[PDB]
C-alpha cells in the first residue's frame, strides 16, 4: 500500500487525475524502469534520478 | 513543491542487454552424413550347382 500515488492537475476549466496503481496505471512502470538524466554539459555528469 | 511544468527533454537513453556473439559466427557444425551402403567383406559363392 506504499508506493501508490495519485497525481492531480486542475486547469481553469477541467481537472485531471492519474494513478500509480490499479486500472489506469501503465505497464511501462512495471515491465521497465524509468530514469531522468540531468546532464551538465561542462562537467559531463549524468545525475540520474528515478522517475515515475 | 509547486510541481511546475519543466522543459522538453533533449533526447533518450535506452538501456537493454546485448547478446554475446563470440560463439555464433563460427563455422557451422552440421550433423554428419550417414555413409552410403558398402558391400560387406568376405562375400563368397556359397551355392554350388547340383551335380
Curated annotation (Swiss-Prot), chain A:
Annotated localization: Nucleus, Nucleolus
Post-translational modification note: In normal conditions, deacetylated by SIRT7, promoting the association of RNA polymerase I with the rDNA promoter region and coding region. In response to stress, SIRT7 is released from nucleoli leading to hyperacetylation of POLR1E/PAF53 and decreased association of RNA polymerase I with the rDNA promoter region.
Disulfide partners: none
Highest taxon of source: Eukaryota
Quaternary organization: Component of the RNA polymerase I (Pol I) complex consisting of 13 subunits: a ten-subunit catalytic core composed of POLR1A/RPA1, POLR1B/RPA2, POLR1C/RPAC1, POLR1D/RPAC2, POLR1H/RPA12, POLR2E/RPABC1, POLR2F/RPABC2, POLR2H/RPABC3, POLR2K/RPABC4 and POLR2L/RPABC5; a mobile stalk subunit POLR1F/RPA43 protruding from the core and additional subunits homologous to general transcription factors POLR1E/RPA49 and POLR1G/RPA34. Forms a heterodimer with POLR1G/RPA34. Interacts with POLR1G. Also binds UBTF/UBF. Interacts with PWP1.
Function: Component of RNA polymerase I (Pol I), a DNA-dependent RNA polymerase which synthesizes ribosomal RNA precursors using the four ribonucleoside triphosphates as substrates. Appears to be involved in the formation of the initiation complex at the promoter by mediating the interaction between Pol I and UBTF/UBF.
Family: Belongs to the eukaryotic RPA49/POLR1E RNA polymerase subunit family.
Record-given protein name: DNA-directed RNA polymerase I subunit RPA49
Shown residues within the full chain: 54 to 105 of 419
Curated annotation (Swiss-Prot), chain B:
Location of this fragment in the whole protein: 103 to 153 of 510
Miscellaneous comment text of the record: It is in an antisense orientation to and overlaps the gene of the DNA repair enzyme ERCC1. This gene overlap is conserved in mouse, suggesting an important biological function.
Compartments, as annotated in UniProt: Nucleus, Nucleolus; Chromosome
Residues recorded with modification Phosphoserine: 26, 34
Oligomeric and partner information: Component of the RNA polymerase I (Pol I) complex consisting of 13 subunits: a ten-subunit catalytic core composed of POLR1A/RPA1, POLR1B/RPA2, POLR1C/RPAC1, POLR1D/RPAC2, POLR1H/RPA12, POLR2E/RPABC1, POLR2F/RPABC2, POLR2H/RPABC3, POLR2K/RPABC4 and POLR2L/RPABC5; a mobile stalk subunit POLR1F/RPA43 protruding from the core and additional subunits homologous to general transcription factors POLR1E/RPA49 and POLR1G/RPA34. Forms a heterodimer with POLR1E/RPA49. Part of Pol I pre-initiation complex (PIC), in which Pol I core assembles with RRN3 and promoter-bound UTBF and SL1/TIF-IB complex.
Protein name (record): DNA-directed RNA polymerase I subunit RPA34
Region ranges (Disordered): 18-41
Role played: Component of RNA polymerase I (Pol I), a DNA-dependent RNA polymerase which synthesizes ribosomal RNA precursors using the four ribonucleoside triphosphates as substrates. Involved in UBTF-activated transcription, presumably at a step following PIC formation.
UniProt family annotation: Belongs to the eukaryotic RPA34 RNA polymerase subunit family.
The organism of origin for this protein: Homo sapiens
Domain of life: Eukaryota
Amino acid at each position: 500500500k506504499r508506493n501508490q500515488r495519485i497525481l492531480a492537475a486542475e486547469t481553469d476549466r477541467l481537472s485531471y487525475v492519474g494513478n500509480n496503481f490499479g486500472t489506469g496505471a501503465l505497464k511501462c512502470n512495471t515491465l521497465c524502469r524509468h530514469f531522468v538524466g540531468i546532464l551538465n554539459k561542462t562537467s559531463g555528469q549524468m545525475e540520474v534520478y528515478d522517475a515515475e | 513543491g509547486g510541481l511546475t511544468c519543466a522543459s522538453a527533454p533533449q533526447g533518450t537513453l535506452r538501456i537493454l542487454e546485448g547478446p554475446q556473439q563470440s560463439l555464433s559466427g563460427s563455422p557451422l557444425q552440421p550433423i554428419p552424413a550417414s555413409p552410403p551402403p558398402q558391400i560387406p567383406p568376405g562375400l563368397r559363392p556359397r551355392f554350388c550347382a547340383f551335380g
